[PDB]
Amino acid sequence: NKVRTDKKERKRAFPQRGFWKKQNFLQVKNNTVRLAFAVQGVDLLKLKRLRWGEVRKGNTGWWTDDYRSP
Amino acid sequence: PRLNVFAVQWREDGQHRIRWFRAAYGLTRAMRAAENFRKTLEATGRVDN
Amino acid sequence: YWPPTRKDRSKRIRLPSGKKCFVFNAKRDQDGELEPVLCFVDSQDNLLMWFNEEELLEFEKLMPRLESYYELWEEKASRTRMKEAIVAEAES
Amino acid sequence: AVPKGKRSKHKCKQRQLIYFFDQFDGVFKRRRESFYRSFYNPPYFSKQTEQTSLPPSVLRPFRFPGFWPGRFAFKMAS
Amino acid sequence: GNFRIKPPGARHAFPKLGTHRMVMFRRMNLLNWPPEDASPLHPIEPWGRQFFVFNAFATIDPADWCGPRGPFPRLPPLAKPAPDAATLAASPSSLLSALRETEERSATRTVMCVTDFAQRPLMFLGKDDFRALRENLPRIKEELKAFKERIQPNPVHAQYDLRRKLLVYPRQAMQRLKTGEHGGYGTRRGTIRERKT
Amino acid sequence: CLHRVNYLLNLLNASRKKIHEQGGDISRVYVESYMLNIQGQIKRPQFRLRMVNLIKTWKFAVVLRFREYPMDEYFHKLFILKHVPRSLTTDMRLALAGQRVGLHAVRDWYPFLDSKTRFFHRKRLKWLDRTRQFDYCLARRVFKSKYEENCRRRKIQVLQARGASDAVIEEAN
Amino acid sequence: IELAKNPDITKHNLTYSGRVRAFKPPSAAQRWEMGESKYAWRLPIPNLLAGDEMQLNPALRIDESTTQMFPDFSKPFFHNAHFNFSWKPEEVPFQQTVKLDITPWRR
Amino acid sequence: GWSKVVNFLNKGVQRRPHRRLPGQPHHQWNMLKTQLDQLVRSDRLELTLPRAHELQQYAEELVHFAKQNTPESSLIVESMIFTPAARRKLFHELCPLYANRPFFYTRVVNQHRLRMRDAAPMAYLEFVDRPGEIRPARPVGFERKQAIWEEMQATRRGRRQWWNHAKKLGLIDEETGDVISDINALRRPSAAEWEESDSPSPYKMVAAPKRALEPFFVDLPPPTERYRKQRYVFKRFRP
Amino acid sequence: SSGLPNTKRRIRDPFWRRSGWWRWRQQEVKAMNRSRAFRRHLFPRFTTETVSFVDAAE
Amino acid sequence: KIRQRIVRIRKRYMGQRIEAGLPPYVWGGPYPQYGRKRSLFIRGEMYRRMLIY
RNA sequence: AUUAACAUAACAACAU
RNA sequence: UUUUUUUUUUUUUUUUUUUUUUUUUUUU
């Protein structure tokens, strides 16, 4: 509970090895959001990955700089 | 469904008797074994009529 | 295995572009089974793709249609050069 | 079973050193030697951390400039 | 493009269930793969393989080329520079417009392309190549038919049959159900009861 | 390769940076001792089949002391005692292996290069001493002069790297 | 700061809540009453109005990237491929019916 | 623990040839099988040292049985791959490569570092004689002979050391008792090469180091850059 | 080696030794260690003065 | 385990064809009968009745 | 800011 | 190729087999 009123803190006391990861569902959700922005034509992943002070117009990256020697 | 096995019902000397047939080895194999057992019963003449 | 010896391929057919092609038995991607295959290679002898009898027969049917496109698109291509040059040679 | 009495300070003290030696001879000493070997090789660079991490490097710095002969810096060009 | 930029309505106009779910995700990555000026794709029956004719961008002469760079060498394109900042400042266009400026390429190289089910480039063919390939078609059918005869069956089946005929084949038990207080005897018998008149 | 050791690591790094900014020579700084102070505890509930245990967490404060070794002291520990740190020797060996120095440096660092060289050097030192051949004061002066000259050249070259004028260089040093 | 917070750009594509499955009742156009006809395009009267201004032919607005080729009736094929309705076309050959056997042992 | 138990228990214990893996045998074999295909598709994989020492056992056998070019061997090779891309690469890029290599096509490199999250050792499992390799590989075949001859001709010590060995290879002229002068005379055609079968076009390909280049520019990122996806998605906590 | 610490390691014990580490033996061992330690120094043969350290605030 | 394996390949193939956009063709052969109840026939009557109403 | 229990450190020792 | 008794061999030595410790060093 958000209010923190139930007995949900009992189990947490004991140590655990690991927990589930809903990757399958999360991936789908992310994909749907990505699609919803792509139909408009804006890259979200690109902006979520670019270096702080980095400028990359369009579909460009490290690879772009290879052939662009001059 | 729960036992996951075939059964054969036949009457002998006015008494009901059922035999087990595990289908773990194969569905078709168990089905054919049960059918052959019933046919053997009828051929040897151990079913009331 | 890849390199076909003299006794495992037919005569190579050279193209104007330098691309070569031959007929040999190739392991299909399905299961790796040998079947009659039409292998295509570039100038540097690199595998690009392959077909089979079915594919080739299918493609032969479609070839006529594709030819019209070559003539059609050419016009466009030509006209784009005129559109670029008319302004390149009049306002440079 | 259950303890019959309380452990003295002395015992604990002894145990402390015992444990420290035990650990040192088997964990720490091995780790130190493993760490020190990597120096010869270039540092490790992670692809994941590229967003914030500094560019790759090979050359190692010198912590003791007092015993560092030879040139330290190059004169500026005209 | 496989998608309409800035489409009308408040919802997608295409299915988003089944295989289409995957296809949308696959195609969203590449919003510009299919040239605006391209012939319709023509897939083949057996294996997903499409054909289409398009126009490619020009390139700089190899003479003027620096050299291969990076793990994927590629020749540079032939394009003019964008307007400079000094001219863009005086231009009446907005900042948004000015920032969004790009180069200008020349599309005058007509070529035929073959892709997979996924519209993945595989090979490129020109007019001369296509014309040359047509003259060798009859010579290739005979070679294919001749080579078809060299294939032989798989000896796997025969070896397995001989193996099973002249070898042992142990079989283990399955479904060893336990029992409670009362044990089993292979067969069971029912009960008999009388009616109450 | 621990997690909770980061807390100590940060203190170490901050102390080194502060001492360097204060102008002290970090190459002559040693850890004297330490001190631990209890702060408190944070207890938590823990239910069981027939009881309710109490789980808690530790909280401690670490106090560290640093001391700088004068030249005199430094000399006696490295030249005589041969109690050189490991970092220095590793650096030296690295440079030697990588060919970052000439053939002249190997011999110069021979007294402090390897354990075998240190031991043989110390034995020769003892023999020299017994033979009335070794001068303590002369060796100390040579040591100190070499160290000070290297330190001075480092700063002079660093200042020259910026392209400063001769007057600026003379006023700085 | 949060690029995901763009309701204007994303439009109704997202739910902005814990709605895994969206709900959309039938549209006005979709409904029978006051709904667009499936056969009114070919009428004479609408074309009059639509003079060099709009094409009412539905065959000129079919997506090519999400449509399959026309199969053969003789050959097995799906119903949903092109049949956008709920009635079997007369073109389709006769189809047989299969009845489940509940007591096959009686044979 | 105590660090002493490890030693006490280990006394008189034999080493295991095959390292144990988490799961049933059927699972373990599957795991190793899939990792072999993934190794074939990459050229280097980063794995734990124990696991790197284990996968190399099958990494060698795959290439050993791929070079036979027999129906029987083909079956065994088939029995060790999943995806078609790995089959294609193994049969089109690796088989030609190791034409002259008797064995030992892989190696293991220790990183001498511990994982941040696990404190575990790390290692690299990279193929031999591949682009961007960690270290160069030695020559084989005629290359080896040329190297040896070069070594011999360099200095006297080499000559002396290789004297015995050279005899077998035929680099010593028995008619004069001296090292062979012309080394190109020992050139032979390898399997990797193409046997002899016996333009003014504008669309001509341009020679370039790995593969040729087309005379046209196509707006397309590399194969490894045209398919993006989030590596991991955060899972919000439920307090 | 490979994912396994060496089995033939030697772990020191500060309070026990196979050769004997009794109270009586400790004395001797300490004595010898101290004796050896002391001798490792090399003091000058000639000095002009000796100056000690003192803390005025303390 | 084998059935769950074959299903995947079948599905994959079919999906590939759908992506390709080829004519919709299936295996027109004798299919099995995993069902037992006449759900479709029993269901039609309810709609008939409802309509009547 | 604050006593004890409790926790750590520095100095002091030689007939051993 | 490994393990085991369901196989095989011995039933002798005890100042023997074996072993962690060179002791004229009476105040390390």
Q: What is the DSSP string of H185-197?
A: GG----TTSPPP-
Q: How far is the CA of I35 from the C1' of K15 (A)?
A: 19
CA D61, CA D68: separation in Å to the nearest integer?
A: 11
Helix, strand, or coil (residue F99):
coil
- Pairing status of strand C34-41 against strand C47-51: antiparallel
Three-point CA angle F27, F29, F33, nearest 5°? 155
For chain G, the first-to-last Cα distance in angstroms comes to 75
What is the crossing angle of helices E19-28 and A23-38, to 10°?
Answer: 60
A and E interact (at least 3 Cβ pairs within 8 A): yes
- Both tokens of H136, joined, read 């160069």
Alpha-carbon dihedral D9, D15, D17, D23, rounded to 10 degrees? -150
Q: Which residues contact A4 (CB under 8 A, 6 or more apart)?
A: H239
Other residues' Cβ atoms within 10 Å of the Cβ of residue E66: 12
- Largest Cα–Cα separation, chain G: 75
Say if residues A47 and G21 touch (Cβ distance below 8 Å). no
Give the C-alpha separation, F66 to F16, whole Å. 10
Check: CB of residue H173 under 8 Å from CB of residue H186. Answer: no
Closest listed residue to residue H48, CA positions, set H130, H133, H132, H119 = H119
Q: How far is I10 from chain F (nearest CA, A)?
A: 22
Measured in residues, chain B has a length of: 49
Q: CA distances (Å), G40 to each of D34, F77, F114, G90, in order?
A: 83, 105, 99, 21
CA A44 to chain centre: 9
Q: Which residue has the tokens 């850059």?
A: H225
Nearest to D22 among I5, I10, I11 (CB): I11
Q: Which residue of G has its CA nearest to A28?
A: G20
Distance CA F122, CA F116 (A): 10
**How far is H161 from D38, CA to CA, in rounded Å?**
35
Residue A16 has phi, psi (to 5 degrees) of: -135, 155
E43 vs H12: CA distance, rounded Å? 68
Phi and psi based region of residue E187 (left: phi greater than 0; alpha: psi -120 to 50; beta: remaining)? beta
Residue H189 phi/psi, 5-degree rounding, is -80, 135
Number of Cβ atoms within 10 Å of the Cβ of C38: 20
Confirm if G73 and G66 have CB atoms less than 8 A apart. no
End-to-end alpha carbon distance in chain B: 30
Local structure of residue H94 (DSSP, 8 states): I
**Measured at the alpha carbon of residue D37, what is the angle toward residues H133 and F93, in degrees to the nearest 5?**
105
Q: How far apart are the C-alpha atoms of J24 and G75, rounded to whole Å?
A: 10
Residue G11 contacts E where some CB pair is shorter than 8 Å: yes
Q: State how far the Cα of G27 lies from the Cα of I29, in Å rounded to an integer.
A: 99
HSE (side-chain half, CA atoms, 13 Å) at E22: 10
DSSP letters for H48-72: -HHHHHHHHHHHHHHHHHHSS-SHH
Least CB–CB distance from E51: residue in C10, C66, C70: C66
Residue G49 to residue H134: CA distance in whole angstroms: 76
Specify whether the CB–CB gap between I14 and D21 falls below 8 A.
yes
Coil vs helix vs strand at D27: helix
Please, which residues bridge with residue E79 across strands?
A: E105
Nearest residue of E to residue G68 by CA position?
Answer: E43
Cα–Cα distance for residue pair F71/H211, rounded to 1 Å:
65
- Breaks, C-N > 2.5 A, in chain J lie after none
- If phi > 0 it is left, if psi is from -120 to 50 it is alpha, else beta; for residue G51 that is beta
**Helix residue spans in A1-70 (DSSP H):** 23-38, 44-47, 64-67
Q: J touches E (3+ CB pairs < 8 Å)?
A: yes
Q: Which structure tokens are listed for F132?
A: 């009335």
- Are F136 and I42 an interchain contact pair (Cβ–Cβ within 8 Å)? yes
Query: CA–CA distance from C40 to each of E123, E133, F144, G21 (Å)?
Result: 10, 11, 77, 49
Say if the Cβ atoms of C59 and E39 lie within 8 Å. no
From the CB of residue C91, how many other CB atoms can be counted at a distance below 10 Å?
6
Is the C-beta atom of F35 closer than 7 angstroms to strand K?
yes
Which candidate from E19, E22, E43 shows the least CB-CB separation from J22? E43
Token readout for F29 is: 């700084």
Would you say F37 and F61 are in contact if contact means Cβ atoms under 8 Å apart?
yes
Tell me the C-alpha distance between G93 and G74, whole Å.
7
Mutate one of D10, D15, D18, D33 to test the I interface: name it (highest I CB count within 10 A).
D18
| Strand L bases within 7 angstroms of protein beta carbons | 20-21, 28
Report the distance separating Cα A38 and Cα F159, nearest Å: 55
What's at A29, amino acid-wise? Answer: K
Residue F21, SS3 per DSSP: helix
Neighbours of G83 (CB within 10 A): 13
Distance separating alpha carbons of residues C73 and E40, to the nearest angstrom = 13
For strand K, the positions having any atom within 7 A of a protein Cβ are 6-10, 16
Phi-psi region of H212 (alpha: psi -120 to 50; beta: other; left: phi over 0): beta
Q: Which two tokens stand for residue E103?
A: 């180069």
Separation in Å, CA G16 to CA E14, E109, G8 = 21, 47, 12
Q: Do D60 and F161 touch (CB under 8 A)?
A: no
Q: Strands H106-114 and H121-127: what pairing?
A: antiparallel
d(CA H66, CA F155): 64
Which neighbouring-strand residues pair with H46? H124
Whole-angstrom distance, CA of residue C20 vs CA of residue C46: 10
Give the residue among H199, H226, H204 at the shortest CA–CA distance from H214.
Answer: H204
Find, in chain E, the residue whose alpha carbon is nearest to that of H203. Answer: E126
DSSP annotation of H12 reads: T
Cα separations in angstroms, H233 against A21, E23, E112, G25, G83: 9, 21, 41, 33, 40
Residues with CB under 7 A from strand L: I 18-19, 27-28, 31-32, 35
User: Crossing angle of helices J2-20/E19-28, nearest 10°?
Assistant: 60
- H49-66 helix and H71-78 helix, angle to the nearest 10 degrees: 150
Contacts for C51 with CB less than 8 Å, ≥ 6 apart: C37, C38, C59
Of E5, J9, H4, the closest CA to residue D21 belongs to H4
Instruction: Encode burial over D21-34: b for 16+ CB neighbours within 10 A, e otherwise.
Output: ebeebbeeeeeeee
Residue type present at position I49: E
- For I31-56, give one letter per residue: b (16+ CB within 10 A) or e: eeeeeeeeeeebeeeeeeeeeeeeee
Nucleotide nearest to I34 (CA to C1'): L28
Q: Which residues of E touch G13 (CB under 8 A)?
A: 11-12
In angstroms, what separates the C-alpha of H152 from chain D's closest C-alpha? 33
Separation CA C10–CA B47 (nearest Å): 74
Q: Taking chain F, what is the end-to-end CA distance rounded to the nearest angstrom?
A: 44
Nearest Cα residue to E44 out of A6, F8, C59:
C59
Residues in a beta bridge with B10: B17
Helix ranges, chain I (H): 23-38
- Distance of F37 CA from K9 C1′ (whole Å): 10
Protein residue closest to K7, using CA and C1': F38
Cβ atoms of H129 and H139 closer than 8 Å: no
**Cβ–Cβ gap C3/H199 under 8 Å:** no
Mutate to test the interface with D, among I2, I7, I9 (most CBs of D within 10 A): I9
Chain E positions touching C49 (Cβ under 8 A) are 114, 122-123
- Chain G residues with CB under 8 Å of J23 CB are 68-72, 77
Distance, C-alpha E34 to centroid of its chain: 14
Given the structure tokens 């035990």, which residue do they identify?
D22
Partners of residue H209 in chain A, C-beta under 8 Å = none
Inter-chain touch F129–I42, beta carbons under 8 Å: yes
Name the β-bridge partners of F67: F30
User: Does D18 touch chain I if contact means CB atoms closer than 8 Å?
Assistant: yes
The tokens for C87 are: 């302004």
Scan for tokens 């090895």, then name that residue. Answer: A17
CA-based nearest residue to C37, from C6, C9, C61, C5: C9
Contact H159, H179 (CB under 8 A): yes
Measured from the CB, is F58 under 7 Å from any atom of strand K?
no
What is the end-to-end Cα distance of chain D in Å, rounded?
86
- H46: CB partners within 8 A, 6+ apart: H122, H123, H124
What strand order describes the sheet that includes E49-57? E42-43, E49-57, E107-116, E121-125
The whole-angstrom separation of Cα H78 and Cα C34 is 13
How far lies F156's CA from each of D78, E78, F23, F27, F153, in Å? 19, 52, 17, 19, 5
DSSP state of D26: I
Q: Residue D49 corresponds to which tokens in the numbers above? A: 């951390």
Specify the 3-state DSSP secondary structure of D18.
Answer: helix
Instruction: For chain F, list the strands marked E by DSSP.
Output: 29-38, 42-47, 52-57, 60-68
Q: What is the distance, to the nearest Å, from the Cα of residue E128 to the centroid of all Cα atoms in its chain?
A: 27
Contacts of F73 (CB under 8 A, 6+ apart): none
CA distance to partner chain E, nearest, from residue C15 (Å): 6
F61 touches strand K (CB under 7 A): no
User: What whole-number distance in Å separates Cα of residue G10 and Cα of residue E12?
Assistant: 11
Under a CB-based contact definition with an 8 Å cutoff, are residues E135 and C60 in contact? no
